[PDB]
């Protein structure tokens, strides 16, 4: 029955039902920062991320709560993570190295070819010789062992490491927990649940957090709702990811794909698109 529209197009509000699992993410650059036997996720008064995750799990007793982690954790840390699963019936630790994301890979060489043709297809003296040389040299230096975009990102230890694999996890969307249903509700660990989510709706089954604090409005990647795996708005984001080797910070492949999917251009109304896309919940403090 029920529809909304944006930029003169109609979209179905689609259900994100009560079995949709919740996913949180923590990627740890420095696992040595924890005491022996503690779970290597920050849990300070300022950033009580682990407590927030467990709080959500206690509140949503009939949903699966996942913790998507990555980093060079010790055996002793793996033990602590395992204890956390044991103390909570509905909590699952998901290590990035155990997930197969290979369906979403692209070869680095393919990416360089594309980047290179495009540079080569430039007017006689608009060509960037400095850039082309560098790109060609970079391409020569790739081994077949290491010729994967995913492998490169998995060795990274910064923010790009986190975002790249968040995007992949949102595509898997529930397949990542391989009871649980097929969408995913992705939340930042600083978000606090104060009650049950219930049934949620989103346009074409996707929504994103909009922060309205400071009397300003900004789309944030901090919470994302998807109703199905491989959502097309996210696959658009995957194309942007596939078109770069080392995307610059704030390239925001994810954001770009979603906006592209709803035809939100730089000339469209930003406030309208925020109202439309927003994930807002009375029982979550975001």
Numbering used by the authors: 21 to 198, 209 to 316
What did the article's authors report about this structure?
The non-LEE encoded effector protein B (NleB) has GT activity and inhibits NF-κB activation by transferring N-acetyl glucosamine (GlcNAc) to host death domain-containing proteins and to glyceraldehyde 3-phosphate dehydrogenase (GAPDH). The glycosylation target is an arginine residue, which was unexpected because the guanidine group of arginine is nucleophilically poor at physiological pH. The T3SS effectors SseK1 and SseK2 from Salmonella typhimurium SL1344 are NleB orthologs that behave as NleB1-like GTs, although they differ in protein substrate specificity. Here, by using a combination of X-ray crystallography, STD-NMR, enzyme kinetics, molecular dynamics simulations, and in vivo experiments, we show that these enzymes are GT-A fold retaining GTs that most likely follow an SNi mechanism.
NleB2 from E. coli O145:H28 was solved in its unliganded form. For NleB2, amino acids 317–326 at the C-terminus were deleted for better crystal packing and Cys21 and Cys199 were also substituted to serine. The overall crystal structures of SseK1 and SseK2 from S. typhimurium as well as NleB2 from enteropathogenic E. coli are similar, revealing high identities between the amino acids at the active binding site level. Furthermore, the sequence alignment shows that the NleB family lacks the arginine residue, though a conserved Trp is present at the C-terminus. We would expect that both the SseK and NleB families have a different conformational behavior of the lid-domain. Each HEN residue of SseK3 is on the β-strand, but in the case of SseK1, SseK2, and NleB2, the HEN residues are located on the loop structure. This has implications for the differences in the activity of the enzymes due to the HEN motif because the loop structure is more flexible than the β-strand. Although the tertiary structure of NleB1 is likely similar to NleB2, SseK1, and SseK2, a previous study has reported that NleB2 has a lower activity than NleB1 on the same target (TRADD).
